[PDB]
Design an enzyme around this catalytic site. Structure first.
Site, PDB file in Angstrom:
ATOM      1  CB  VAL A 151      82.477 -11.384 -47.945  1.00  0.00           C
ATOM      2  CG1 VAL A 151      81.517 -10.340 -48.496  1.00  0.00           C
ATOM      3  CG2 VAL A 151      83.732 -11.456 -48.798  1.00  0.00           C
ATOM      4  CG  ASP A 187      87.915 -15.341 -59.951  1.00  0.00           C
ATOM      5  OD1 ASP A 187      87.929 -16.433 -60.563  1.00  0.00           O
ATOM      6  OD2 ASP A 187      87.536 -15.229 -58.767  1.00  0.00           O
TER       7      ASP A 187
HETATM    8  C1  LIG Z   1      85.492 -13.206 -52.812  1.00  0.00           C
HETATM    9  C2  LIG Z   1      84.508 -12.094 -52.880  1.00  0.00           C
HETATM   10  N1  LIG Z   1      84.817 -10.818 -52.907  1.00  0.00           N
HETATM   11  C3  LIG Z   1      83.600 -10.142 -52.926  1.00  0.00           C
HETATM   12  C4  LIG Z   1      83.282  -8.806 -53.003  1.00  0.00           C
HETATM   13  F1  LIG Z   1      84.291  -7.929 -53.155  1.00  0.00           F
HETATM   14  C5  LIG Z   1      81.983  -8.348 -53.024  1.00  0.00           C
HETATM   15  C6  LIG Z   1      80.921  -9.264 -52.987  1.00  0.00           C
HETATM   16  C7  LIG Z   1      79.512  -8.784 -53.032  1.00  0.00           C
HETATM   17  N2  LIG Z   1      78.571  -9.725 -52.819  1.00  0.00           N
HETATM   18  C8  LIG Z   1      77.279  -9.339 -52.803  1.00  0.00           C
HETATM   19  N3  LIG Z   1      76.343 -10.298 -52.664  1.00  0.00           N
HETATM   20  C9  LIG Z   1      76.564 -11.732 -52.707  1.00  0.00           C
HETATM   21  C10 LIG Z   1      75.304 -12.421 -53.239  1.00  0.00           C
HETATM   22  C11 LIG Z   1      75.459 -13.935 -53.274  1.00  0.00           C
HETATM   23  N4  LIG Z   1      75.841 -14.389 -51.923  1.00  0.00           N
HETATM   24  S1  LIG Z   1      75.540 -15.944 -51.565  1.00  0.00           S
HETATM   25  C12 LIG Z   1      76.561 -16.918 -52.600  1.00  0.00           C
HETATM   26  O1  LIG Z   1      74.180 -16.190 -51.919  1.00  0.00           O
HETATM   27  O2  LIG Z   1      75.950 -16.141 -50.212  1.00  0.00           O
HETATM   28  C13 LIG Z   1      77.132 -13.834 -51.476  1.00  0.00           C
HETATM   29  C14 LIG Z   1      76.994 -12.327 -51.367  1.00  0.00           C
HETATM   30  O3  LIG Z   1      78.303 -11.829 -51.096  1.00  0.00           O
HETATM   31  N5  LIG Z   1      76.812  -8.086 -52.949  1.00  0.00           N
HETATM   32  C15 LIG Z   1      77.734  -7.148 -53.174  1.00  0.00           C
HETATM   33  C16 LIG Z   1      79.077  -7.426 -53.240  1.00  0.00           C
HETATM   34  F2  LIG Z   1      79.902  -6.401 -53.503  1.00  0.00           F
HETATM   35  C17 LIG Z   1      81.214 -10.631 -52.925  1.00  0.00           C
HETATM   36  C18 LIG Z   1      82.545 -11.040 -52.902  1.00  0.00           C
HETATM   37  N6  LIG Z   1      83.147 -12.306 -52.892  1.00  0.00           N
HETATM   38  C19 LIG Z   1      82.470 -13.621 -52.978  1.00  0.00           C
HETATM   39  C20 LIG Z   1      81.646 -13.900 -51.736  1.00  0.00           C
HETATM   40  C21 LIG Z   1      81.676 -13.750 -54.266  1.00  0.00           C
END
Ligand SMILES: Cc1nc2c(F)cc(-c3nc(N[C@@H]4CCN(S(C)(=O)=O)C[C@H]4O)ncc3F)cc2n1C(C)C
EC number: 2.7.11.26
Length: 332
Positions: free
Chosen positions: A33, A139
């Protein structure tokens, strides 16, 4: 360095999309990501790059194309790269319920109950919405609950474990993040319902009140021992409904002395062994724990108005339309 791709909006007609300032922000068995900045608007996006087999559709993509809700991260675009990779482009949200909770926990403080009400209510709205389509997230955990720091708007993310549940078609039981995993999953149930997400939401609520996970299992099996330490050994009938004998700990003694009784009551109606005994998300939204949110004088701690909490569509209310008399207060 600007990257230009041909992306389809999340009307299947692709357009050229340019982005820059890419950086890795997340990981998994699916791939990576990234965070990136769109060239025209300067808007920040999250780009989820998944290794995709050209033989069969991507389940996450098919689910994301059907969702349009204020409390779910929006799929702006999707595109292909390279060995083919599917890339999902979503609006970037900088904070999470996990990071917020951890900040309070490290400072030996509890998150103000107004925030617990705002976050849980918006999570229940997103779940009432996805559950109205037969879609189970599978999840629900604080890391997947994105937050806007100034507006207190919550958005559900990561539909990589999500699935449209169809009766008669079995589903995997080793699913969900361990601390938030419903007991029927630990018993190996394959015919479970959307109520596994309501168990997960109850674990998030209890964690926000306690300042730490309510069931911190050290393995998929010890997760059930941690649950049993609080709810007591499930009866033979409870076990039947799902798929070291101990007596249940009283709910009032699980939480801290000043914990609002309405928060404990809501928690007790979510963390039930019997999947059908748990509140549905719409019913949880109508609980008296969220009464303060329906007060016409309610404000965020920074003085601003709360987000739009009463703009329910017919689809969101479809499971129980008469609940709109409690859900939409007369002033709205
Ligand atoms: C496995 C997964 N699939 C994801 C997805 F489809 C979309 C997003 C997503 N994330 C975000 N922001 C998150 C804010 C927090 N941070 S951190 C922990 O401070 O580094 C990770 C960052 O990915 N914004 C929009 C999204 F759609 C994040 C996703 N993740 C994890 C990284 C939570």
């Amino acid at each position: 360095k600007v990257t230009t791709v041909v992306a389809t909006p999340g009307p299947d007609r692709p357009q050229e999309v340019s982005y820059t300032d890419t950086k890795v922000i997340g990981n998994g068995s699916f791939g990576v990501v990234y965070q990136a900045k769109l060239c025209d608007s300067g808007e920040l996006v999250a780009i989820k790059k998944v290794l995709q087999d050209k033989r069969f559709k991507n389940r996450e993509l098919q689910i994301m194309r059907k969702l349009d809700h204020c409390n779910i991260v929006r799929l702006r675009y999707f595109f292909y790269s390279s060995e083919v990779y599917l890339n999902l482009v979503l609006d970037y949200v900088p904070e999470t319920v996990y990071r917020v909770a951890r900040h309070y926990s490290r400072a030996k403080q509890t998150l103000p109950v107004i925030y617990v009400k705002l976050y849980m209510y918006q999570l229940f709205r997103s779940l009432a919405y996805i559950h109205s389509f037969g879609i189970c997230h599978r999840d629900i955990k604080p890391q997947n609950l994105l937050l806007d720091p100034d507006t207190a708007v919550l958005k559900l993310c990561d539909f990589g474990s999500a699935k449209q549940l169809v009766r008669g078609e079995p589903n995997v039981s080793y699913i969900c993040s361990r601390y938030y995993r419903a007991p029927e999953l630990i018993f190996g149930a394959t015919d479970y319902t959307s109520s596994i997400d309501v168990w997960s939401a109850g674990c998030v609520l209890a964690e926000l009140l306690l300042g730490q996970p309510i069931f911190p299992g050290d393995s998929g099996v010890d997760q059930l021992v941690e649950i049993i330490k609080v709810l007591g050994t499930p009866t033979r009938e409870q076990i039947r409904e799902m798929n070291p004998q101990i007596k249940a700990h009283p709910w009032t003694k699980v939480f801290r002395p000043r914990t609002p009784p309405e928060a404990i009551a809501l928690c007790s109606r979510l963390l039930e062994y019997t999947p059908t005994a748990r509140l549905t998300p719409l019913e949880a939204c109508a609980h008296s724990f969220f009464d303060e949110l329906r007060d016409p004088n309610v404000k965020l701690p920074n003085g601003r108005d709360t987000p739009a909490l009463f703009n329910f569509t017919t689809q969101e209310l479809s499971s129980n339309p008469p609940l709109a008399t409690i859900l939409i207060p007369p002033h709205a």
